[PDB]
Design a protein around this ligand. Structure first.
Ligand SMILES: *Cc1c(COP(=O)(O)O)cnc(C)c1O
Ligand SMILES: *Cc1c(COP(=O)(O)O)cnc(C)c1O
Ligand SMILES: O=C1CCCCCN1
Ligand SMILES: O=C1CCCCCN1
Lengths: 426, 422
């Protein structure tokens, strides 16, 4: 009878990543509306896909006009204007050069896979560098180089809070890279996949200067540098593109989630020679469909119009300030990290040992949900709170979210172990 | 203010292009695409079958606008949401079905087919697959994976081992199964009308028989209806013409009536075997879900399978008259508004007329008609228009098609060469 019960009866568990019985019938701004009418503040923004929140007027206007008069439904066998305009608008925002083209998909998973397959096709080099704990997607293609393909080389992420080999600079990781590359035929690696802030590892910001150095090693060895900005892309970091923080330009940019503002949309920006090496090669019927592209353009127009990178920079300091405020009261909070409105809070059993507090995290978000706050956890040990709110979240929503979070830290023990065992999580 | 099509060439890479002619679209209304210059073309492609309700259908507009205005979140991964749930129930209500099956939502047929395969392997441990030569299950690593028993599709127009019944294909199948350990094959993937093969309806009874053999061996029957499902065949589900019910149904294309939306209908045990297993962030998103609902609602409300059956026969009847005037036409085939026309150099030899097929669609494009070719040989014109296409739209496209056949020589080899196509 209840919506959550009906979901359990109609929808298989295969795609479920449930942390609590959240059941939604509506949405407005940064709020989700449960079946009964209860309002929750969404600090997850659907893992960041709701870039502009819910029922944003520019999304509404864009998608309504597109549905009323659609330019076909595909970029495959026809050129359509909404997609072409979005392609140029994405091209404009990327420097360079260039000589770059767009490939459109439904998701970050299909875009990382396309990027890979295009590289191997265009160059003949099938080897891949990727980072341990990396999330590039859940398709057979994009999982092949995600964390636990032949010629896959996995490197530790440059994690300040847990430095590889206890070297805080990351120099040991670059040294490992170097040892790994010479154990493998010269010119055999075609690509290096990089998250500028590692999402699934625990929203990890790498040590300053590391990515630039890593890219320089890559460029010196013929290896194309692919920046997977699905989670942290498009203004979320407080800059239009997250690599703008790291003093390097990737050869390839992968975009997703927040790009569609609520509709399935991803994109690969890659040199023309990579995307033109084949035709009818990586394709799905509704790729570059006009309704998705219209929303995508409404996201970009709104980013520019509202200076959303500047907003995300502002609202992110406000959010991190408040979280530090909570650390001063709650010993579980070991680490606050992030850029713009991509923030991570690591919870630990002891601030010195930095041992992961998995059970408390699960109880925390469950309680948070009961209090009216939607936040999920992420990370290797399930101990990292992830904050990726709508970019249009108001300061008033953030203060309210902080008060509810404070309350959830204090009221955590209320959550029974059997309540938590109802929900498999990751 | 360059040409739209030239702007396309400069911004959008070739990787996903399946281009046969310089079609550049700025609008759509019913079964008509509106090019940049304001010429309306009758769409016989319906975007490979995705535009099941055509362009600007009121039901899609109402549902999409309302969903955009008040979205129940953006995902089904981490929240339950009402639109996704309502649509899942509705799809299960359309299948038999009750308490045995569950729904998994995707973006596309490729991911839906990939999810079905991964779920089966995970749930049953049986990684072995049976599939048909020339099958199209999608264009991702996961969906092009299908260890493998490959069979010829039973094509009445091109029989296997000189057996038009198709019984030699059932005999080959029996041999391959006997040759490999019992319980090593988990799934059989079937198109009940083979799309990439060139819209082939198999001989009567073959699939029913094929399904028996599978169940006899503990093999799950997966019916891939991404192209040909949802009212398109003259029934809601194409397997209803075939006297069997599949264990798993894959749905896509027309399902979103223009938005990306796919679905797998599978036994609960297959879909409940693991969690956080096959998932992408925008899966089950409410704007696609609402669009799926509008499609299912319109199908029932405007009796679209019956309309497809009517308009299909009228379309194929018209094409038989073209065959009386144009010797190129060798076989007209299909169910409902999913039809194929195989073009041959001799009706006895059944030798494929590839070169002439390309010119035909190029020519037809110039005339105001959107239509494409498929098949291993590039000689079968696919007809998959909006289930909404009008009786007037059909007659009008038949005249244009007639005119296209008469004017093939007007299109040169150098014009054909400018478009890479398949
Ligand atoms: C979410 C994400 C993906 C995959 O996107 P989906 O829409 O879930 O397929 C890939 N890479 C990163 C870094 C992501 O965050
Ligand atoms: C189109 C199609 C697919 C794949 O759908 P995409 O959206 O193109 O990935 C799979 N099977 C059949 C029969 C199809 O027609
Ligand atoms: O019908 C199809 C499948 C969709 C991808 C383009 C090829 N043709
Ligand atoms: O951050 C992510 C990627 C989106 C899919 C759900 C898993 N978590």
């Amino acid at each position: 009878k209840a919506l959550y019960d009906r979901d359990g009866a109609a929808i298989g568990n295969l795609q479920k990543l449930r942390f609590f019985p959240l059941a939604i019938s509506g949405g407005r701004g940064a709020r989700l509306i449960e079946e009964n009418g209860r309002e929750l503040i969404d600090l997850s923004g659907a893992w960041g896909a709701a870039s502009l929140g819910y029922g944003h007027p520019a999304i509404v206007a864009a998608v309504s006009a597109a549905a009323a008069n659609p330019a076909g439904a595909t970029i495959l066998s026809a050129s359509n204007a909404p997609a072409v305009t979005l392609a140029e608008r994405l091209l404009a925002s990327f420097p360079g050069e260039g000589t770059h083209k767009i490939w459109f998909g439904h998701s970050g998973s299909d875009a990382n896979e396309a990027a890979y397959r295009a590289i191997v096709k265009a160059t003949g080099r099938s080897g891949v560098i990727a980072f341990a704990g990396a999330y590039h997607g859940c398709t057979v293609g994009s999982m092949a180089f995600s964390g636990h393909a032949d010629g896959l080389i996995l490197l530790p992420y440059p994690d300040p809070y847990r430095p590889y080999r206890n070297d805080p600079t990351g120099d040991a990781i670059l040294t490992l890279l170097t040892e790994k590359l010479a154990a493998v035929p010269a010119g055999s690696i075609g690509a290096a996949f990089i998250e500028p802030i590692q999402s699934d590892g625990g929203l990890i910001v790498p040590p300053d200067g590391f990515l630039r150095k890593f890219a320089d090693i890559c460029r010196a060895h013929g290896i194309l540098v692919v920046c997977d900005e699905v989670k942290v892309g498009l203004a979320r970091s407080g800059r239009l593109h997250c690599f703008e923080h790291e003093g390097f330009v990737p050869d390839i940019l992968v975009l997703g989630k927040g790009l569609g503002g609520g509709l399935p949309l991803s994109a690969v920006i890659a040199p023309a020679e990579i995307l033109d090496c084949a035709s009818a090669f990586a394709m799905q019927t509704l790729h570059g469909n006009p309704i998705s592209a219209a929303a995508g353009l409404a996201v970009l127009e709104t980013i520019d119009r509202d200076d959303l990178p500047a907003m995300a920079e502002r609202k992110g300091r406000l959010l991190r300030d408040g979280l530090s405020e909570l650390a001063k009261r709650h010993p579980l909070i070991g680490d606050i990290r992030g850029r713009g409105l991509a923030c991570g809070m690591e919870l630990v059993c002891d601030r010195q040992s930095r041992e992961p507090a998995r059970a408390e995290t699960a109880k925390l978000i469950y309680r948070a949900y009961q209090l009216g706050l939607v936040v999920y956890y992420v990370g290797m040990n399930g101990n990292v709170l992830e904050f990726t709110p709508p970019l249009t979240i108001t300061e008033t929503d953030i203060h309210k979210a902080l008060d509810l979070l404070d309350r959830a830290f204090s009221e955590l023990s209320a959550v029974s172990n059997e309540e938590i065992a109802q929900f498999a999580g990751w």
